Design a protein around this ligand. Structure first.
Ligand SMILES: [Zn+2]
Ligand SMILES: [Zn+2]
Ligand SMILES: [Zn+2]
Length: 92
DNA sequence: TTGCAGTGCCCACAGAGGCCAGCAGGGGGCGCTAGTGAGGTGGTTTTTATATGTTTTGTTATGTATTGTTTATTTTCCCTTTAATTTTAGGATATGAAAACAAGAAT
């Protein structure tokens, strides 16, 4: 098992992607064989993956969405994604 | 910019295996003692053995009694010669008993 320890332990039958964890195999499988049994309580949307889209539910319906400012350096403009702040800060 | 498909990372509870005290297995070496077992020494008696005294046994000498021996005085058997003692005539006695005589008595 030291061969399999901290490696791509679980192969996928349909495609050659591999993940270390089983949970990843169940989520990966649902994309190939569409089950999407997770459903926002306020809209029609049916989600494949777990509570990240339950976070969809939360935010799409909660007026307390509160987008984290995440202010940069001197210019100070706000962006919703970390990679954007790092790239624009490198030359700001 | 988002949904979708696929990846990264952080945690955490399991899982795992070395760490550790606890504890039980077989075996080595000592502390100490009850209880015989045997061996050696001392005492006792005892038993054999030895020596002394008394008595019993064996041997020797003297006296008495028994058997034998040639005398030796009976003694006893056998002669020839007397000394009573007996037997046989031969004469004499005696005492009896007739016989004769004499004396009474009778006829
Ligand atoms: Zn696949
Ligand atoms: Zn919704
Ligand atoms: Zn800036």
């Amino acid at each position: 098992q030291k061969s399999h320890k901290n490696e791509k332990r679980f192969k996928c039958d349909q495609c050659d992607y591999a993940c270390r964890q089983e949970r990843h195999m169940i989520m990966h499988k649902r994309t190939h064989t569409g089950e999407k049994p997770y459903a926002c309580s306020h809209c029609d949307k049916t989600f494949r993956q777990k509570q990240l889209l339950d976070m969809h539910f939360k935010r799409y319906h909660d007026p307390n969405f509160v987008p984290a400012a995440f202010v940069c350096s001197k210019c100070g403009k706000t962006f919703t994604r970390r990679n954007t702040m790092a790239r624009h800060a490198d030359n700001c």
